[PDB]
Coordinates of C-alpha atoms in Angstrom, one line a residue:
Chain A
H1 CA -82.6 -226.2 -59.9
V2 CA -83.2 -223.6 -57.3
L3 CA -86.9 -223.0 -56.2
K4 CA -87.5 -219.2 -56.0
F5 CA -89.4 -218.4 -52.6
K6 CA -89.4 -214.8 -52.6
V7 CA -91.7 -213.3 -49.9
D8 CA -92.1 -209.9 -51.4
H9 CA -96.1 -209.9 -51.2
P10 CA -98.8 -210.5 -48.4
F11 CA -98.6 -213.9 -46.6
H12 CA -99.9 -215.9 -43.8
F13 CA -97.4 -217.0 -41.0
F14 CA -97.6 -219.0 -37.9
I15 CA -95.2 -220.2 -35.2
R16 CA -95.9 -223.9 -34.3
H17 CA -94.8 -226.3 -31.6
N18 CA -94.0 -229.2 -33.9
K19 CA -94.3 -232.3 -31.6
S20 CA -97.8 -231.2 -30.3
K21 CA -98.6 -229.5 -33.7
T22 CA -100.0 -226.4 -31.6
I23 CA -100.2 -223.1 -33.4
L24 CA -98.8 -220.5 -30.7
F25 CA -98.9 -217.7 -33.0
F26 CA -100.6 -216.7 -36.1
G27 CA -100.7 -213.7 -38.4
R28 CA -100.9 -212.0 -41.7
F29 CA -98.4 -209.6 -42.9
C30 CA -99.6 -207.3 -45.7
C31 CA -98.6 -203.7 -44.9
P32 CA -94.9 -202.7 -44.1
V33 CA -94.3 -200.4 -41.2
Chain B
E1 CA -105.1 -241.0 -22.8
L2 CA -102.8 -238.0 -22.1
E3 CA -101.6 -237.8 -25.7
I4 CA -105.0 -238.1 -27.2
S5 CA -106.0 -235.1 -24.7
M6 CA -103.1 -233.0 -26.0
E7 CA -104.1 -233.8 -29.7
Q8 CA -107.7 -232.5 -28.9
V9 CA -106.6 -229.3 -27.5
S10 CA -104.1 -228.5 -30.2
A11 CA -106.9 -229.5 -32.8
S12 CA -109.5 -227.0 -31.0
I13 CA -106.9 -224.3 -30.9
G14 CA -106.1 -224.7 -34.6
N15 CA -109.9 -224.6 -35.5
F16 CA -110.4 -221.5 -33.3
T17 CA -107.3 -219.8 -35.0
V18 CA -108.7 -220.0 -38.4
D19 CA -112.3 -219.1 -37.0
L20 CA -110.8 -216.2 -35.1
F21 CA -108.6 -215.0 -38.0
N22 CA -111.6 -215.2 -40.5
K23 CA -113.8 -213.2 -38.1
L24 CA -111.0 -210.5 -37.6
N25 CA -110.6 -210.6 -41.5
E26 CA -114.2 -209.7 -42.1
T27 CA -113.9 -206.1 -40.8
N28 CA -110.1 -205.4 -41.6
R29 CA -109.1 -206.9 -45.0
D30 CA -106.3 -204.5 -45.4
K31 CA -104.5 -204.7 -42.0
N32 CA -101.8 -206.6 -40.3
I33 CA -103.2 -209.2 -38.0
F34 CA -101.1 -211.0 -35.3
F35 CA -102.2 -212.8 -32.2
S36 CA -101.6 -215.9 -30.0
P37 CA -104.4 -218.4 -30.3
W38 CA -102.8 -220.4 -27.3
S39 CA -102.9 -217.4 -25.1
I40 CA -106.5 -216.5 -26.1
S41 CA -107.9 -220.1 -25.8
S42 CA -105.8 -220.6 -22.5
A43 CA -107.3 -217.6 -20.6
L44 CA -110.7 -218.5 -22.0
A45 CA -110.3 -222.1 -21.0
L46 CA -109.6 -221.1 -17.5
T47 CA -112.7 -218.9 -17.8
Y48 CA -114.7 -221.9 -19.1
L49 CA -113.7 -224.0 -16.1
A50 CA -116.0 -221.7 -14.1
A51 CA -118.8 -221.5 -16.6
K52 CA -122.3 -223.2 -16.4
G53 CA -125.3 -223.9 -18.8
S54 CA -125.4 -222.0 -21.9
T55 CA -122.6 -219.6 -20.7
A56 CA -120.3 -222.7 -20.9
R57 CA -121.8 -224.3 -24.0
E58 CA -121.3 -221.3 -26.1
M59 CA -117.6 -220.9 -25.0
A60 CA -116.9 -224.5 -25.6
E61 CA -118.6 -224.4 -29.1
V62 CA -116.6 -221.1 -30.1
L63 CA -113.3 -222.6 -28.8
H64 CA -114.0 -226.0 -30.5
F65 CA -113.9 -227.9 -27.2
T66 CA -117.2 -229.3 -28.4
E67 CA -119.2 -229.4 -31.5
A68 CA -122.1 -227.2 -32.3
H69 CA -123.4 -228.6 -20.0
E70 CA -120.9 -231.0 -19.3
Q71 CA -117.3 -229.8 -18.6
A72 CA -114.9 -231.2 -21.2
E73 CA -112.4 -232.6 -18.8
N74 CA -110.3 -234.0 -21.6
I75 CA -109.6 -230.5 -22.6
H76 CA -108.5 -229.1 -19.2
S77 CA -106.3 -232.2 -19.1
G78 CA -104.9 -231.5 -22.5
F79 CA -104.2 -227.8 -21.5
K80 CA -102.2 -229.0 -18.5
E81 CA -99.9 -231.4 -20.4
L82 CA -99.4 -228.8 -23.2
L83 CA -98.5 -226.0 -20.7
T84 CA -96.1 -228.6 -19.0
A85 CA -94.4 -229.3 -22.3
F86 CA -94.0 -225.7 -23.2
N87 CA -92.6 -224.9 -19.9
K88 CA -90.0 -227.7 -20.0
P89 CA -86.6 -226.6 -18.7
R90 CA -84.3 -225.5 -21.4
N91 CA -81.3 -223.1 -22.2
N92 CA -81.2 -223.3 -26.1
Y93 CA -84.2 -221.1 -26.6
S94 CA -86.9 -219.5 -24.6
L95 CA -90.4 -220.8 -24.5
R96 CA -92.7 -220.0 -21.5
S97 CA -96.4 -219.7 -20.5
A98 CA -98.1 -218.9 -17.4
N99 CA -101.6 -218.4 -15.9
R100 CA -102.8 -216.3 -12.9
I101 CA -106.0 -215.4 -11.3
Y102 CA -106.4 -211.9 -9.7
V103 CA -109.5 -211.6 -7.7
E104 CA -111.2 -208.9 -5.5
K105 CA -109.8 -209.6 -1.9
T106 CA -113.6 -209.2 -0.5
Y107 CA -114.7 -211.7 -3.3
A108 CA -114.9 -215.4 -2.2
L109 CA -114.0 -218.1 -5.0
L110 CA -115.1 -221.8 -4.5
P111 CA -111.9 -223.9 -3.3
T112 CA -113.0 -226.5 -5.9
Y113 CA -112.3 -223.9 -8.7
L114 CA -108.9 -223.0 -7.2
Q115 CA -107.6 -226.4 -7.0
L116 CA -108.7 -227.3 -10.5
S117 CA -107.3 -224.1 -11.8
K118 CA -104.1 -224.6 -10.0
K119 CA -104.1 -228.3 -11.3
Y120 CA -104.9 -227.8 -15.1
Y121 CA -103.6 -224.3 -15.7
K122 CA -101.0 -223.7 -13.0
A123 CA -103.0 -220.8 -12.0
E124 CA -102.6 -219.5 -8.5
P125 CA -105.1 -216.9 -7.0
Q126 CA -103.8 -213.4 -5.9
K127 CA -106.0 -211.3 -3.7
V128 CA -106.2 -207.6 -4.8
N129 CA -108.1 -204.6 -4.0
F130 CA -110.2 -203.6 -6.8
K131 CA -112.9 -202.2 -5.0
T132 CA -111.0 -199.1 -3.5
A133 CA -107.5 -199.4 -5.3
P134 CA -108.1 -200.3 -9.1
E135 CA -104.7 -198.5 -10.3
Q136 CA -102.7 -200.4 -7.6
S137 CA -104.3 -203.7 -8.9
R138 CA -104.0 -202.6 -12.6
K139 CA -100.2 -201.8 -12.2
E140 CA -99.6 -205.0 -10.2
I141 CA -101.2 -207.1 -13.0
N142 CA -99.2 -205.2 -15.8
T143 CA -95.9 -205.7 -13.8
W144 CA -96.6 -209.6 -13.7
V145 CA -97.3 -209.7 -17.2
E146 CA -94.0 -207.6 -18.1
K147 CA -92.1 -210.3 -16.1
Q148 CA -93.6 -213.3 -17.9
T149 CA -92.9 -211.4 -21.4
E150 CA -89.4 -210.0 -20.9
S151 CA -91.1 -206.6 -21.0
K152 CA -92.3 -207.1 -24.7
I153 CA -96.1 -206.9 -23.3
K154 CA -95.7 -203.8 -21.3
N155 CA -98.9 -201.8 -20.2
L156 CA -101.5 -204.7 -20.9
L157 CA -104.3 -203.0 -19.1
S158 CA -105.3 -199.3 -19.1
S159 CA -107.4 -197.3 -16.5
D160 CA -110.5 -197.9 -18.7
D161 CA -110.2 -201.7 -18.2
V162 CA -109.5 -202.0 -14.5
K163 CA -112.3 -200.2 -12.2
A164 CA -114.0 -200.5 -9.0
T165 CA -116.5 -202.8 -10.2
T166 CA -113.9 -205.3 -11.3
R167 CA -113.9 -208.7 -9.6
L168 CA -111.7 -211.0 -11.3
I169 CA -109.1 -210.9 -13.9
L170 CA -107.9 -214.2 -15.4
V171 CA -104.6 -213.8 -17.4
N172 CA -102.4 -216.0 -19.6
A173 CA -99.0 -214.9 -20.9
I174 CA -96.8 -216.3 -23.5
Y175 CA -93.1 -215.7 -24.3
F176 CA -91.0 -217.4 -27.0
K177 CA -87.6 -216.4 -28.5
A178 CA -85.4 -218.7 -30.5
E179 CA -82.7 -218.6 -33.2
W180 CA -83.4 -220.1 -36.5
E181 CA -81.9 -223.5 -37.2
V182 CA -80.2 -221.8 -40.2
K183 CA -79.8 -218.3 -39.6
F184 CA -79.8 -215.4 -42.4
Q185 CA -76.5 -213.4 -42.8
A186 CA -77.0 -209.8 -42.3
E187 CA -74.6 -208.9 -45.2
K188 CA -77.0 -210.4 -47.6
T189 CA -80.0 -208.2 -46.3
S190 CA -80.8 -205.2 -48.5
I191 CA -83.6 -202.8 -49.3
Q192 CA -86.2 -204.3 -51.4
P193 CA -89.7 -203.4 -52.5
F194 CA -92.7 -205.3 -50.8
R195 CA -95.6 -205.4 -53.0
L196 CA -98.9 -204.6 -51.1
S197 CA -100.8 -205.0 -54.2
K198 CA -100.5 -205.2 -58.0
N199 CA -100.4 -201.2 -58.2
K200 CA -98.7 -200.5 -54.8
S201 CA -95.3 -201.6 -53.2
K202 CA -93.2 -200.0 -50.1
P203 CA -89.5 -200.7 -49.2
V204 CA -88.4 -203.1 -46.6
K205 CA -85.2 -204.8 -45.3
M206 CA -85.4 -208.0 -47.2
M207 CA -83.3 -210.9 -45.8
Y208 CA -81.9 -213.4 -48.0
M209 CA -80.3 -217.0 -48.0
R210 CA -80.0 -219.9 -50.4
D211 CA -80.6 -223.2 -48.3
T212 CA -82.8 -226.3 -48.2
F213 CA -86.1 -226.3 -46.3
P214 CA -89.4 -228.3 -46.5
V215 CA -91.7 -226.8 -49.1
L216 CA -95.0 -227.6 -50.4
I217 CA -95.9 -226.5 -53.9
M218 CA -99.8 -226.4 -54.5
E219 CA -100.1 -225.0 -58.2
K220 CA -103.7 -225.8 -58.3
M221 CA -104.7 -223.8 -55.4
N222 CA -102.0 -221.2 -56.4
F223 CA -99.8 -221.1 -53.4
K224 CA -96.5 -222.5 -51.6
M225 CA -95.8 -223.2 -48.1
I226 CA -92.4 -223.5 -46.5
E227 CA -91.5 -224.4 -43.1
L228 CA -88.5 -222.5 -41.2
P229 CA -87.3 -224.4 -38.3
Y230 CA -86.1 -222.9 -35.1
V231 CA -83.3 -224.5 -33.1
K232 CA -83.6 -228.4 -33.0
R233 CA -86.8 -228.1 -35.2
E234 CA -88.9 -228.1 -31.9
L235 CA -90.7 -225.1 -33.2
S236 CA -90.9 -223.7 -36.7
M237 CA -92.5 -220.6 -38.7
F238 CA -94.5 -221.7 -41.6
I239 CA -95.1 -219.2 -44.2
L240 CA -98.2 -219.4 -46.6
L241 CA -97.3 -217.6 -49.9
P242 CA -99.5 -217.2 -52.7
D243 CA -97.9 -218.0 -56.2
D244 CA -97.9 -214.5 -57.1
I245 CA -100.5 -211.5 -56.6
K246 CA -103.5 -212.9 -58.6
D247 CA -106.4 -210.6 -57.3
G248 CA -107.3 -206.9 -56.8
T249 CA -106.3 -206.4 -53.2
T250 CA -103.5 -208.3 -51.3
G251 CA -103.1 -211.6 -53.4
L252 CA -104.6 -213.6 -50.3
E253 CA -108.4 -213.6 -51.3
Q254 CA -108.3 -217.1 -52.5
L255 CA -106.3 -218.5 -49.6
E256 CA -108.2 -216.5 -47.1
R257 CA -111.7 -217.8 -48.8
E258 CA -110.5 -221.3 -48.8
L259 CA -108.8 -221.3 -45.4
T260 CA -109.7 -224.2 -43.0
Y261 CA -107.7 -226.0 -40.2
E262 CA -108.3 -229.4 -41.8
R263 CA -106.5 -228.1 -44.9
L264 CA -104.0 -226.2 -42.9
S265 CA -103.2 -229.4 -40.9
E266 CA -103.1 -231.6 -44.2
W267 CA -100.6 -229.2 -45.7
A268 CA -98.4 -228.8 -42.5
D269 CA -97.4 -232.3 -42.4
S270 CA -97.9 -233.4 -45.9
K271 CA -95.7 -236.1 -47.6
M272 CA -95.5 -233.7 -50.6
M273 CA -93.9 -231.0 -48.4
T274 CA -90.2 -232.2 -49.2
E275 CA -87.0 -230.9 -48.6
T276 CA -86.3 -228.2 -51.5
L277 CA -83.2 -226.1 -52.1
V278 CA -84.7 -222.4 -52.2
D279 CA -83.7 -219.0 -52.8
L280 CA -85.4 -217.6 -49.8
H281 CA -86.2 -213.9 -49.4
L282 CA -87.9 -213.1 -46.1
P283 CA -88.7 -209.4 -44.8
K284 CA -87.2 -208.2 -41.5
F285 CA -90.5 -207.3 -39.9
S286 CA -92.0 -206.5 -36.5
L287 CA -95.8 -206.5 -35.6
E288 CA -97.6 -205.0 -32.5
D289 CA -101.2 -205.2 -31.7
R290 CA -103.9 -204.9 -29.1
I291 CA -107.6 -205.5 -29.2
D292 CA -110.6 -206.0 -26.9
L293 CA -112.1 -209.3 -28.2
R294 CA -115.6 -208.8 -26.6
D295 CA -117.2 -207.9 -30.0
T296 CA -115.2 -210.4 -32.0
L297 CA -116.2 -213.2 -29.4
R298 CA -119.6 -212.1 -29.5
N299 CA -120.0 -212.2 -33.3
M300 CA -118.4 -215.9 -33.2
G301 CA -121.2 -217.0 -30.9
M302 CA -119.8 -216.3 -27.4
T303 CA -122.7 -214.0 -26.2
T304 CA -124.3 -214.9 -22.8
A305 CA -120.8 -214.6 -21.1
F306 CA -120.9 -211.0 -21.7
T307 CA -124.6 -210.5 -20.4
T308 CA -126.2 -210.1 -17.1
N309 CA -127.5 -213.8 -17.7
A310 CA -124.0 -215.0 -17.5
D311 CA -123.4 -218.0 -15.3
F312 CA -120.1 -218.5 -13.6
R313 CA -121.2 -220.6 -10.7
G314 CA -118.2 -223.1 -11.2
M315 CA -116.1 -220.5 -9.2
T316 CA -118.9 -219.0 -7.0
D317 CA -122.3 -219.5 -5.4
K318 CA -123.8 -216.1 -6.6
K319 CA -124.8 -215.4 -10.3
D320 CA -123.4 -211.9 -10.2
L321 CA -120.4 -212.2 -12.5
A322 CA -119.9 -211.4 -16.3
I323 CA -117.3 -210.8 -18.6
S324 CA -116.8 -207.1 -19.3
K325 CA -113.6 -207.2 -21.6
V326 CA -111.0 -209.7 -23.1
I327 CA -108.0 -207.8 -23.6
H328 CA -105.4 -209.4 -26.1
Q329 CA -101.9 -207.8 -26.8
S330 CA -99.4 -209.4 -29.0
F331 CA -95.8 -208.9 -30.4
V332 CA -93.5 -210.4 -32.8
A333 CA -90.2 -209.4 -34.2
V334 CA -88.3 -211.4 -37.1
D335 CA -84.9 -210.8 -38.1
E336 CA -81.6 -212.6 -39.3
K337 CA -80.9 -214.3 -35.9
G338 CA -84.6 -215.7 -35.4
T339 CA -87.7 -214.7 -34.0
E340 CA -89.0 -213.2 -30.8
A341 CA -92.7 -213.3 -30.0
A342 CA -95.2 -212.8 -27.0
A343 CA -98.7 -212.2 -26.0
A344 CA -101.1 -211.8 -23.1
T345 CA -104.9 -212.3 -22.7
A346 CA -106.7 -210.7 -19.9
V347 CA -110.4 -211.8 -19.1
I348 CA -111.9 -209.2 -17.0
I349 CA -114.9 -210.1 -15.0
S350 CA -117.3 -207.7 -13.0

């Protein structure tokens, strides 16, 4: 089957440098505009 | 040795990220949050290099260089090697970070501090005239930040930040831009409702694709996590999404209550996080923010550095310096092609 991953409600997100596992940016998006 | 140093700094930054987010979240539960913990920790680490006694100890504890003063040489070494890794020459995407020391021309700094700052943070000193030309100095610093950030962090410092009393400004900048490994197709993007809560939603440009990504399903803890790699999977965007909206606000109450870096680290490289075919819907979005972190850092336990009892005799022979402000400014734009992200941190000392 196909898993539904619909990001249509507030979420945390972060950008990671994978080899070092260093978080470069972190955020929460909960409010459009 | 160097590998362990890098792991220790990366771990410290991860712990700091969660603590910082948690502190920011206390007052602003219903607002967008976005920062670069790399940039903040880098600038404060360069500041910590100059700190002594309780000033140093508090900073080390808040930044997770030590557990809650002997300088953490392993940390400075870890920052050095990480900075080198991030600044590797490449033309397949953009990743760069830089540090700089702006100092009052009349204010002498210890040579040992400058060589260590150059070694571990690649930060060179630039003499500026704060005393009788604060606006000249401000614009000079803002211009450098613009250059390091492809003009995405424009006017970092304001006239309220740089004054005749300013003696040092330690600045970190970071810039990132990369395509997704698998890009969204613009034709599949459409206007869809984004649900702020159970009883509220607003329209956003929702990108869509069907493809395979690493996904961790945590049914018991009511969330899923996905990894969206950028080119060559050298960096990724991770997204933590609650299973639905199962509380009276944003849906993130459980996740935010139970958020720890230990958990986040375990999830991010879990064996359960396997490649899964997914109908991925992701908003096209962009966030900008700016904050003086003084109050936040004080509330986290970094207090003495902001007082008349501050001790920065690692960079000077006089006990006449204290941190006035810690300005952090950030930017991110997520679209079908990839992501552009940028930030700067300015530690202002007077």
